[PDB]
PDB file of all heavy atoms in Angstrom:
ATOM      1  N   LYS H  15       0.858  -1.237  -0.025  1.00  9.83           N
ATOM      2  CA  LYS H  15      -0.046  -0.059  -0.005  1.00  9.83           C
ATOM      3  C   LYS H  15       0.923   1.268   0.005  1.00  9.83           C
ATOM      4  O   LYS H  15       0.325   2.304  -0.274  1.00  9.83           O
ATOM      5  CB  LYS H  15      -0.961  -0.035   1.136  1.00  9.83           C
ATOM      6  CG  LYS H  15      -2.036   0.963   1.033  1.00  9.83           C
ATOM      7  CD  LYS H  15      -2.884   0.983  -0.299  1.00  9.83           C
ATOM      8  CE  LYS H  15      -3.313   2.405  -0.658  1.00  9.83           C
ATOM      9  NZ  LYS H  15      -3.880   3.157   0.485  1.00  9.83           N
ATOM     10  N   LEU H  16       2.190   1.182   0.080  1.00 11.02           N
ATOM     11  CA  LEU H  16       3.066   2.328  -0.342  1.00 11.02           C
ATOM     12  C   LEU H  16       3.467   2.091  -1.826  1.00 11.02           C
ATOM     13  O   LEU H  16       3.983   2.993  -2.449  1.00 11.02           O
ATOM     14  CB  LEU H  16       4.403   2.221   0.613  1.00 11.02           C
ATOM     15  CG  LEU H  16       4.250   3.044   1.923  1.00 11.02           C
ATOM     16  CD1 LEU H  16       3.083   2.667   2.715  1.00 11.02           C
ATOM     17  CD2 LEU H  16       5.473   3.049   2.612  1.00 11.02           C
ATOM     18  N   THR H  17       2.926   1.027  -2.422  1.00 10.81           N
ATOM     19  CA  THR H  17       2.839   0.808  -3.863  1.00 10.81           C
ATOM     20  C   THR H  17       1.866   1.688  -4.535  1.00 10.81           C
ATOM     21  O   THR H  17       1.827   1.924  -5.686  1.00 10.81           O
ATOM     22  CB  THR H  17       2.691  -0.777  -4.074  1.00 10.81           C
ATOM     23  OG1 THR H  17       3.872  -1.438  -3.470  1.00 10.81           O
ATOM     24  CG2 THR H  17       2.487  -1.178  -5.560  1.00 10.81           C
ATOM     25  N   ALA H  18       0.648   1.926  -3.722  1.00 11.18           N
ATOM     26  CA  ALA H  18      -0.461   2.655  -4.202  1.00 11.18           C
ATOM     27  C   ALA H  18      -0.035   4.206  -4.071  1.00 11.18           C
ATOM     28  O   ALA H  18      -0.523   5.039  -4.814  1.00 11.18           O
ATOM     29  CB  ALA H  18      -1.717   2.398  -3.505  1.00 11.18           C
ATOM     30  N   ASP H  19       0.821   4.524  -2.966  1.00 10.05           N
ATOM     31  CA  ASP H  19       1.164   5.881  -2.683  1.00 10.05           C
ATOM     32  C   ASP H  19       2.065   6.436  -3.746  1.00 10.05           C
ATOM     33  O   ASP H  19       2.103   7.703  -4.150  1.00 10.05           O
ATOM     34  CB  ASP H  19       1.768   6.045  -1.276  1.00 10.05           C
ATOM     35  CG  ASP H  19       2.868   6.957  -1.139  1.00 10.05           C
ATOM     36  OD1 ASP H  19       2.653   8.197  -1.487  1.00 10.05           O
ATOM     37  OD2 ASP H  19       3.906   6.620  -0.626  1.00 10.05           O
ATOM     38  N   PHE H  20       2.879   5.543  -4.384  1.00  9.33           N
ATOM     39  CA  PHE H  20       3.758   5.887  -5.471  1.00  9.33           C
ATOM     40  C   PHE H  20       2.959   6.437  -6.685  1.00  9.33           C
ATOM     41  O   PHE H  20       2.570   5.660  -7.627  1.00  9.33           O
ATOM     42  CB  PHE H  20       4.653   4.673  -5.870  1.00  9.33           C
ATOM     43  N   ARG H  21       2.596   7.637  -6.663  1.00  6.72           N
ATOM     44  CA  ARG H  21       1.593   8.346  -7.403  1.00  6.72           C
ATOM     45  C   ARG H  21       1.291   9.694  -6.841  1.00  6.72           C
ATOM     46  O   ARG H  21       1.063  10.778  -7.458  1.00  6.72           O
ATOM     47  CB  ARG H  21       0.297   7.367  -7.448  1.00  6.72           C
ATOM     48  N   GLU H  22       1.276   9.720  -5.450  1.00  4.92           N
ATOM     49  CA  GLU H  22       1.103  10.973  -4.624  1.00  4.92           C
ATOM     50  C   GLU H  22       2.399  11.765  -4.752  1.00  4.92           C
ATOM     51  O   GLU H  22       3.315  11.714  -4.061  1.00  4.92           O
ATOM     52  CB  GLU H  22       0.736  10.587  -3.137  1.00  4.92           C
ATOM     53  CG  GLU H  22      -0.307   9.610  -3.169  1.00  4.92           C
ATOM     54  N   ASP H  23       2.311  12.562  -5.925  1.00  2.66           N
ATOM     55  CA  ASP H  23       3.430  13.435  -6.240  1.00  2.66           C
ATOM     56  C   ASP H  23       3.162  14.729  -5.831  1.00  2.66           C
ATOM     57  O   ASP H  23       2.243  15.407  -6.221  1.00  2.66           O
ATOM     58  CB  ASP H  23       3.536  13.352  -7.933  1.00  2.66           C
ATOM     59  CG  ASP H  23       2.230  13.656  -8.633  1.00  2.66           C
ATOM     60  OD1 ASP H  23       1.096  13.723  -8.028  1.00  2.66           O
ATOM     61  OD2 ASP H  23       2.093  13.641  -9.852  1.00  2.66           O
ATOM     62  N   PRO H  24       4.127  15.298  -4.987  1.00  3.05           N
ATOM     63  CA  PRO H  24       4.299  16.834  -4.783  1.00  3.05           C
ATOM     64  C   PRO H  24       4.960  17.352  -6.083  1.00  3.05           C
ATOM     65  O   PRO H  24       4.312  17.316  -7.151  1.00  3.05           O
ATOM     66  CB  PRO H  24       5.074  16.899  -3.401  1.00  3.05           C
ATOM     67  CG  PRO H  24       5.229  15.505  -2.952  1.00  3.05           C
ATOM     68  CD  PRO H  24       4.950  14.590  -4.010  1.00  3.05           C
ATOM     69  N   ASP H  25       6.182  17.695  -6.093  1.00  5.64           N
ATOM     70  CA  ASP H  25       7.090  17.753  -7.308  1.00  5.64           C
ATOM     71  C   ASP H  25       7.139  16.406  -7.929  1.00  5.64           C
ATOM     72  O   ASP H  25       7.589  15.520  -7.201  1.00  5.64           O
ATOM     73  CB  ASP H  25       8.329  18.468  -7.221  1.00  5.64           C
ATOM     74  CG  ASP H  25       9.375  18.132  -8.261  1.00  5.64           C
ATOM     75  OD1 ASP H  25      10.021  17.111  -7.999  1.00  5.64           O
ATOM     76  OD2 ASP H  25       9.522  18.844  -9.056  1.00  5.64           O
ATOM     77  N   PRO H  26       6.837  16.167  -9.148  1.00  6.52           N
ATOM     78  CA  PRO H  26       6.753  14.841  -9.753  1.00  6.52           C
ATOM     79  C   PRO H  26       8.046  14.177  -9.660  1.00  6.52           C
ATOM     80  O   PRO H  26       8.857  13.597 -10.491  1.00  6.52           O
ATOM     81  CB  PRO H  26       6.524  15.110 -11.249  1.00  6.52           C
ATOM     82  CG  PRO H  26       6.772  16.477 -11.434  1.00  6.52           C
ATOM     83  CD  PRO H  26       6.436  17.178 -10.207  1.00  6.52           C
ATOM     84  N   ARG H  27       8.613  14.176  -8.241  1.00  6.77           N
ATOM     85  CA  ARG H  27       9.733  13.622  -7.741  1.00  6.77           C
ATOM     86  C   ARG H  27       9.381  12.728  -6.579  1.00  6.77           C
ATOM     87  O   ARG H  27       9.853  12.895  -5.391  1.00  6.77           O
ATOM     88  CB  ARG H  27      10.744  14.863  -7.404  1.00  6.77           C
ATOM     89  CG  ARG H  27      10.270  15.462  -5.916  1.00  6.77           C
ATOM     90  CD  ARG H  27      11.101  15.184  -4.733  1.00  6.77           C
ATOM     91  NE  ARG H  27      11.871  13.946  -4.895  1.00  6.77           N
ATOM     92  CZ  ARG H  27      13.214  14.069  -5.470  1.00  6.77           C
ATOM     93  NH1 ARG H  27      13.890  15.266  -5.791  1.00  6.77           N
ATOM     94  NH2 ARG H  27      13.716  12.884  -5.787  1.00  6.77           N
ATOM     95  N   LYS H  28       8.475  11.918  -6.822  1.00  7.83           N
ATOM     96  CA  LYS H  28       8.080  10.929  -5.951  1.00  7.83           C
ATOM     97  C   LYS H  28       9.290  10.044  -5.657  1.00  7.83           C
ATOM     98  O   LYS H  28      10.499  10.523  -5.517  1.00  7.83           O
ATOM     99  CB  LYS H  28       7.007  10.000  -6.651  1.00  7.83           C
ATOM    100  CG  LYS H  28       7.200   9.473  -7.947  1.00  7.83           C
ATOM    101  CD  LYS H  28       5.851   9.454  -8.871  1.00  7.83           C
ATOM    102  CE  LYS H  28       5.944   8.607 -10.082  1.00  7.83           C
ATOM    103  NZ  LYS H  28       4.724   7.854 -10.340  1.00  7.83           N
ATOM    104  N   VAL H  29       9.141   8.806  -5.032  1.00  8.15           N
ATOM    105  CA  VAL H  29      10.119   7.650  -4.934  1.00  8.15           C
ATOM    106  C   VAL H  29       9.273   6.482  -4.334  1.00  8.15           C
ATOM    107  O   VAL H  29       8.546   6.558  -3.221  1.00  8.15           O
ATOM    108  CB  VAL H  29      11.269   8.158  -3.955  1.00  8.15           C
ATOM    109  CG1 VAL H  29      12.183   6.887  -3.533  1.00  8.15           C
ATOM    110  CG2 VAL H  29      12.154   9.021  -4.573  1.00  8.15           C
ATOM    111  N   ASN H  30       9.302   5.401  -4.924  1.00 10.80           N
ATOM    112  CA  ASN H  30       9.170   4.104  -4.191  1.00 10.80           C
ATOM    113  C   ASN H  30      10.543   3.624  -3.759  1.00 10.80           C
ATOM    114  O   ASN H  30      11.246   3.059  -4.517  1.00 10.80           O
ATOM    115  CB  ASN H  30       8.439   3.024  -5.078  1.00 10.80           C
ATOM    116  CG  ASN H  30       8.024   1.751  -4.490  1.00 10.80           C
ATOM    117  OD1 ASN H  30       8.717   1.213  -3.636  1.00 10.80           O
ATOM    118  ND2 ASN H  30       6.825   1.359  -4.791  1.00 10.80           N
ATOM    119  N   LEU H  31      10.873   3.789  -2.501  1.00  7.10           N
ATOM    120  CA  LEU H  31      11.782   3.023  -1.792  1.00  7.10           C
ATOM    121  C   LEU H  31      11.181   2.025  -0.907  1.00  7.10           C
ATOM    122  O   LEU H  31      11.595   1.723   0.237  1.00  7.10           O
ATOM    123  CB  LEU H  31      12.917   4.012  -1.065  1.00  7.10           C
ATOM    124  CG  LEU H  31      13.489   4.902  -1.752  1.00  7.10           C
ATOM    125  CD1 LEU H  31      14.779   5.403  -0.953  1.00  7.10           C
ATOM    126  CD2 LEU H  31      13.986   4.586  -3.057  1.00  7.10           C
ATOM    127  N   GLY H  32       9.993   1.480  -1.446  1.00  8.89           N
ATOM    128  CA  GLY H  32       8.871   0.870  -0.643  1.00  8.89           C
ATOM    129  C   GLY H  32       8.990  -0.589  -0.947  1.00  8.89           C
ATOM    130  O   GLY H  32       9.423  -1.336   0.001  1.00  8.89           O
ATOM    131  N   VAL H  33       8.515  -1.000  -1.999  1.00  6.20           N
ATOM    132  CA  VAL H  33       8.397  -2.447  -2.441  1.00  6.20           C
ATOM    133  C   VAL H  33       9.702  -3.087  -2.575  1.00  6.20           C
ATOM    134  O   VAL H  33      10.718  -2.384  -3.100  1.00  6.20           O
ATOM    135  CB  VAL H  33       7.537  -2.655  -3.714  1.00  6.20           C
ATOM    136  CG1 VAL H  33       8.144  -2.207  -4.882  1.00  6.20           C
ATOM    137  CG2 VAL H  33       7.245  -4.083  -3.914  1.00  6.20           C
ATOM    138  N   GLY H  34       9.758  -4.368  -2.065  1.00  6.26           N
ATOM    139  CA  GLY H  34      10.882  -5.184  -2.233  1.00  6.26           C
ATOM    140  C   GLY H  34      10.839  -5.877  -3.556  1.00  6.26           C
ATOM    141  O   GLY H  34      10.387  -7.054  -3.690  1.00  6.26           O
ATOM    142  N   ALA H  35      11.333  -5.187  -4.614  1.00  8.07           N
ATOM    143  CA  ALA H  35      11.597  -5.653  -5.867  1.00  8.07           C
ATOM    144  C   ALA H  35      12.695  -4.898  -6.415  1.00  8.07           C
ATOM    145  O   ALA H  35      12.919  -3.764  -6.221  1.00  8.07           O
ATOM    146  CB  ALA H  35      10.404  -5.419  -6.695  1.00  8.07           C
ATOM    147  N   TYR H  36      13.558  -5.680  -7.146  1.00  7.78           N
ATOM    148  CA  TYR H  36      14.757  -5.073  -7.825  1.00  7.78           C
ATOM    149  C   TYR H  36      14.431  -4.183  -8.869  1.00  7.78           C
ATOM    150  O   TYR H  36      13.518  -4.413  -9.631  1.00  7.78           O
ATOM    151  CB  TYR H  36      15.763  -6.264  -8.195  1.00  7.78           C
ATOM    152  CG  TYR H  36      16.944  -5.726  -9.060  1.00  7.78           C
ATOM    153  CD1 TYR H  36      18.076  -5.211  -8.426  1.00  7.78           C
ATOM    154  CD2 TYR H  36      16.884  -5.649 -10.309  1.00  7.78           C
ATOM    155  CE1 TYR H  36      19.166  -4.708  -9.158  1.00  7.78           C
ATOM    156  CE2 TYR H  36      17.979  -5.142 -11.125  1.00  7.78           C
ATOM    157  CZ  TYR H  36      19.133  -4.710 -10.447  1.00  7.78           C
ATOM    158  OH  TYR H  36      20.194  -4.272 -11.121  1.00  7.78           O
ATOM    159  N   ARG H  37      15.121  -2.994  -8.899  1.00  8.44           N
ATOM    160  CA  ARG H  37      14.830  -2.000  -9.871  1.00  8.44           C
ATOM    161  C   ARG H  37      16.237  -1.682 -10.417  1.00  8.44           C
ATOM    162  O   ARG H  37      17.175  -1.374  -9.738  1.00  8.44           O
ATOM    163  CB  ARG H  37      14.265  -0.687  -9.271  1.00  8.44           C
ATOM    164  CG  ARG H  37      12.737  -0.988  -8.821  1.00  8.44           C
ATOM    165  CD  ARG H  37      11.743  -1.134 -10.086  1.00  8.44           C
ATOM    166  NE  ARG H  37      10.376  -1.186  -9.687  1.00  8.44           N
ATOM    167  CZ  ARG H  37       9.825  -2.196  -9.220  1.00  8.44           C
ATOM    168  NH1 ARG H  37      10.286  -3.318  -9.222  1.00  8.44           N
ATOM    169  NH2 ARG H  37       8.518  -2.115  -8.910  1.00  8.44           N
ATOM    170  N   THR H  38      16.198  -1.416 -11.823  1.00 11.23           N
ATOM    171  CA  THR H  38      17.376  -1.189 -12.577  1.00 11.23           C
ATOM    172  C   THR H  38      17.952   0.285 -12.245  1.00 11.23           C
ATOM    173  O   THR H  38      17.209   1.022 -11.533  1.00 11.23           O
ATOM    174  CB  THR H  38      17.169  -1.403 -14.029  1.00 11.23           C
ATOM    175  OG1 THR H  38      16.101  -0.543 -14.434  1.00 11.23           O
ATOM    176  CG2 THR H  38      16.769  -2.881 -14.460  1.00 11.23           C
ATOM    177  N   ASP H  39      18.934   0.682 -12.945  1.00 12.61           N
ATOM    178  CA  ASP H  39      19.489   2.004 -12.681  1.00 12.61           C
ATOM    179  C   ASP H  39      18.496   3.042 -13.285  1.00 12.61           C
ATOM    180  O   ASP H  39      18.623   4.192 -13.261  1.00 12.61           O
ATOM    181  CB  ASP H  39      20.875   2.298 -13.254  1.00 12.61           C
ATOM    182  CG  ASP H  39      21.548   3.596 -12.642  1.00 12.61           C
ATOM    183  OD1 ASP H  39      21.685   3.552 -11.358  1.00 12.61           O
ATOM    184  OD2 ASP H  39      21.774   4.576 -13.509  1.00 12.61           O
ATOM    185  N   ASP H  40      17.650   2.480 -14.196  1.00  9.00           N
ATOM    186  CA  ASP H  40      16.654   3.351 -14.976  1.00  9.00           C
ATOM    187  C   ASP H  40      15.219   3.104 -14.331  1.00  9.00           C
ATOM    188  O   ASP H  40      14.192   3.446 -14.979  1.00  9.00           O
ATOM    189  CB  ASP H  40      16.600   3.140 -16.378  1.00  9.00           C
ATOM    190  CG  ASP H  40      18.064   3.030 -17.079  1.00  9.00           C
ATOM    191  OD1 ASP H  40      19.032   3.736 -16.633  1.00  9.00           O
ATOM    192  OD2 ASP H  40      18.175   2.142 -17.946  1.00  9.00           O
ATOM    193  N   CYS H  41      15.252   2.754 -13.064  1.00  7.77           N
ATOM    194  CA  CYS H  41      14.129   2.586 -12.238  1.00  7.77           C
ATOM    195  C   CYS H  41      12.965   1.662 -12.872  1.00  7.77           C
ATOM    196  O   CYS H  41      11.767   2.056 -12.726  1.00  7.77           O
ATOM    197  CB  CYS H  41      13.463   3.978 -11.798  1.00  7.77           C
ATOM    198  SG  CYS H  41      13.971   4.426 -10.135  1.00  7.77           S
TER     199      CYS H  41
END
């Protein structure tokens, strides 16, 4: 449910450091 929050953009400078899934250098 921090996977759903990844969308709540102040400056379209969000971040998922939330879900445990590997992400490449290009996110």
Side-chain angles (χ1 to χ4, degrees), residues 15-19 23-41:
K15 195 49 217 311
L16 272 57
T17 298
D19 146 52
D23 46 358
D25 155 274
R27 78 106 342 84
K28 53 211 194 146
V29 171
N30 193 314
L31 301 205
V33 64
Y36 172 82
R37 289 289 190 273
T38 61
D39 197 67
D40 317 320
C41 259

